[PDB]
Amino acid sequence: IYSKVLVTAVYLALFVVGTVGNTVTLFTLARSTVHYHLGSLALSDLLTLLLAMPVELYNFIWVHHPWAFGDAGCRGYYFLRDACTYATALNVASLSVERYLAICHPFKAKTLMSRSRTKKFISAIWLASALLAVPMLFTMGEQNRSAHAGGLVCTPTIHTATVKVVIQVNTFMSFIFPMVVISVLYTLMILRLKSVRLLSGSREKDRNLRRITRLVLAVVIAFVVCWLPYHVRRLMFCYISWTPFLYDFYHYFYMVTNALFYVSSTINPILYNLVSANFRHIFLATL
Template identity: 45%
Template sequence: MESSNPQPPRPSPSPALSLDARLGVDTRLWAKVLFTALYALIFALGTAGNALSAHVVLKGRAGPPGRLRYHVLSLALSGLLLLLVSVPVELYNFVWFHYPWAFGDLGCRAYYFVRELCAYTTVLSVASLSAERCLAVCQPLRARRLLSPRRTRRLLSLVWAASLGLALPMAIIMGQKYELETADGEPEPASRVCTVLVSRATLRVFIQVNVLVSFVLPLALTAFLNGVTVSHLVALCSQVPSTSAPGSPTPSHVELTSEERRTPPLGGQASLVRHKDSCRLRRLQHSVQVLRAIVAVYVFCWMPYHVRRLMYCYVSDDGWTGTLYNFYHYFYLVTNTLFYVSSAVTPVLYNVVSSSFRKLFLKALGSLCREHHRMEP
C-alpha cells in the first residue's frame, strides 16, 4: 500500500478467498464513502484555492510584498501539484481498489516522487521564508542589501532543485511488483501493487532519515528563527517613540498623521521617521503572523503522518497482530487526509491574515465567475 506498509498477518492463500482477504486488506464501505467525500472536498477547495493564489501573485500588483509573494507562489504551486497528482491516484488505488495497481511501474515511482518533492519543497520554502524574515527584523540594513526579489527567485529555484534531488531516492526504492503467484508459479496479475522494492531494514533507515530531513530539522530551524524574530520584534516595538500610551499597540496611520499635523516644522522629519518605522514594524509583524500560522498548520497536519511512518520502523514483524494492522490501515487514511489538508488550507490562511490578499483573491474569484456567467448561453 505504501512505503511504510507492514506485512499483515494473512490467512492461508486459498484461491477460494477473495483477493483482499488473501492479501490482508479490507476497507469497509463506510470508510470508502467517508474518505471519498473528504478527498473530494479537499481536492476541490485545495486546487481552486492554490490556483487562485498563484493567479493573484502572478497578476496582482498589490498583495504580499515583493519577496513574500514568491514564497506564496512556491507554496501554492507545491500544493497544487501535490493535490492534482496524489489525491486522484490515492483515492482510486488506495481507498477503493487496492489491487491491482493500475498506473504501471512508472506511475508508481512518479506518484511517490511527487509526494516527496512537494513535501520537501513546502518545508524548505517555509524555512527559507523564516530565514528572510529573521534577517529583515534582526539586520534590516543588511537585509536591504542582500535580499531582493531576484535573489529570492534564485533561492526558491535552489529550493526546488534541492527538493528534486532529495525526492529522487523515493523514485528508486519504490516500484511495481506482484504479491501472489498462481498455481503454476507465475505472478498473479490481480495482485500487482505499488510498494517498496528494498529490504525492510533499508526502508527503516530511509524512513528515519526522511522524517529527520523533511520534518524535524526544517521545522526545528523554523521554530528557532521564529523565536528570534519575535523577540526582536518585541524589542523594536518597545523602542518606538511614545506616540501613544505605554503598553498600547503600535500607533495607527491615522494617529501618526494627526501627530504629524501637531508637530512643529522642525520636528517633521522625526515624525516621518517614526511613521516609516511603525509601518515597517506592522509589515514585519504581519508577515511573521502569516509564517507562524503556516508553520502551526504544517506541524498539526504533518506530525501524525510522520508518526505513522515511524510506527512501522519500531513495530517488529512479530508485533503486527490483526488488530494492530487494522488500526494502522485506517490510521493511514486519516494521516494522509491531514497531509493533504495542509495544502488545501494554506490559501485560507493567506485570506484570513492578509486583508489585501483577501481583496485580490475575491476580486479574481469574482472576475472568473463573471466570465463564466458571460459564457453561458
C-alpha cells in the same frame, strides 16, 4: 464500502477548495519578496492535488488489486509525494528566514535578499527537492506476485532493513532539521518584538512588519499540526513490530494521517484571507 464513500467525499471537498484557492492565489499575487515564497507554496500544493490524489483514489481506496499504472507509474507516484514533501518544508523554512532578516538586520537584508537573488534561491529549492526524492525511485517497483490473489502489485523491491534506513533519513532531512531552524529563528524574533519601541523608524512601516510576521507564524503552526503526526506514523513502521483494540487503533491512525497530507495543501489560502484585509479585497476582486 461505507468507509470508502466517507473517505471519498472528504477528498473531493478538499480538491475543490484547494484547487480554486491556490489558482486564484497565483494571479492575485501576480498583478514582493514575500510574494515569491507564497507563490512557490501554491505551486507545490497544486501538484499534490492534481496528480497525487487521483492515483490515490483509484488504486488505493477503490481498486486495491491489481496495480494498473505500470512499473513507471509506480515509481513516479512515490517519487512525486517525496518531492512535494521536501518542497513544502524547504519553502516554509526559507520563508521563515526572510522574516528574521527583516526584523533583526533591516539594512543588511536589502542586499542579502534581492529580487534577482530571490528568483535564484527558489530555483535551487525545487532542484534540491527532486534530488532528495531520487532514492524512492529505486526503492519501489512493480512485481508479479504469485498466489491474497496473485498478480501485479506495487511493492518494495529491496531488503526491508534497508527500507527502514531510507524512511528514517527522510524524516530527519524533511522534518526534524527544518523544525530546529524554524524554532530558533522565531524565538529570537519574539524577544526583539517584545522589547523594541519602533521597528524601521516609522509607525506605518512598523505596523506593516508586525502584521506580515504574524501571518507567517500562522503558516508555521498549521505546518506542524499536519506534518508531525504523519512522521510519527512512518516511525511506527520502523519500530513497532496485537489484540482487537490495538489493531483498530492502528488502522484509524493510518487513515487519519493520509487525509492530513491533503489538508496541508488546502489550508494556506484560507489563512491569508482571514489574517490580511488587503489580500482579501484583491483576492475577492480576482475571484
